[PDB]
């Protein structure tokens, strides 16, 4: 992880132009539907019996919001993402038993929702390149304390 000036500016600008309260809910609902095994972790969040219920699900919505605010901390400091997520990694492994491959899948759903919201001109190939590098660094940090 050596950020170019362009990548840093792309990531900060991108983050500033999305509503995490819109995106978080959308990306988590999308994950639970497209990668259905992830429901393993959310069966207590009310009705997830259908695609529609998941997408109208207030609890899943609230939880998507916390994921996104979880990422705010990474954006605030692109140079120390590994330490930012140390505690969160431990929690997801040892308390929650989340397969860390699902962090990759969630990141991919975040990409898809950001692309839908911004469109292909604003979310250009170079913006996606910086966003992907950011997400890969985040995903690695989240997985780092699994043993």
């Amino acid at each position: 992880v050596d950020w170019t000036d362009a990548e840093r500016s792309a990531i900060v600008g991108l983050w500033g132009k999305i509503s995490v309260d819109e995106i978080g809910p959308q990306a988590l609902a999308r994950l639970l539907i497209v990668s259905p095994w992830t429901q393993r972790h959310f069966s207590t969040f009310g009705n997830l019996s259908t695609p529609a219920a998941i997408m109208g699900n207030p609890a899943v919505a609230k939880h998507g919001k916390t994921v996104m605010h979880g990422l705010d901390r990474a954006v605030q400091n692109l140079d120390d993402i590994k330490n930012t997520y140390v505690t969160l990694s431990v929690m997801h492994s040892e308390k929650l038993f989340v397969d860390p491959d699902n962090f990759r899948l969630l990141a991919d759903c975040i990409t898809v929702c950001v692309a839908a919201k911004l469109g292909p001109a604003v979310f250009s190939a170079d913006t996606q390149e910086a966003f992907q590098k950011f997400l890969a660094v985040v995903v690695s940090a989240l997985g780092r304390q699994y043993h």
Binding site: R30, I33, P51, G119, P120, S124, E129
Partner: protein, 142 residues
């Protein structure tokens, strides 16, 4: 395997994609190359690998034309893709792990072009389609 409902979902979204097929192909390939530069390994004989360059445009069309044709072949993608699987394996020698990378970028591009239509249910079906298409391109390897 695709369900009846997956197939109906795929055809419906392709209704929106087809009128923009060339542009979508260019966008998908451009993004795979820039965002996942590991894939540039197969394309260094091109004049350019920059987004929207002439070689990327030309090949983007080639890819999308094939995928568009697969949409009409969802009852048997493996049979439909055998010759193309052979070509990638034997002549081009593409590590098949890259097929999913292309699939991911197309999904990104579809979402970007058709945000309202690309619901999670539609996304699930298209991902199922593209994963099968990847598997079918991988079928004649080794």
């Amino acid at each position: 395997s695709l369900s009846a409902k997956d197939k109906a979902n795929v055809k419906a979204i392709w209704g929106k994609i087809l009128p923009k097929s060339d542009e979508i192909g260019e966008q998908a390939l451009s993004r795979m190359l820039v965002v996942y530069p590991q894939t540039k390994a197969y394309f260094s004989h091109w004049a350019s690998v920059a987004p929207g360059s002439a070689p990327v445009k030309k090949h983007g069309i080639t890819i999308m034309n094939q995928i568009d044709d697969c949409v009409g072949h969802m009852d048997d993608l493996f049979g439909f893709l055998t010759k193309l699987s052979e070509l990638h394996a034997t002549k081009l020698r593409v590590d098949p792990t890259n097929f999913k990378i292309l699939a991911h970028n197309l999904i990104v591009v579809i979402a970007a072009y058709f945000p309202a239509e690309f619901t999670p249910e539609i996304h699930l079906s298209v991902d199922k389609f593209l994963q099968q298409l990847a598997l079918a391109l991988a079928e004649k390897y080794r």
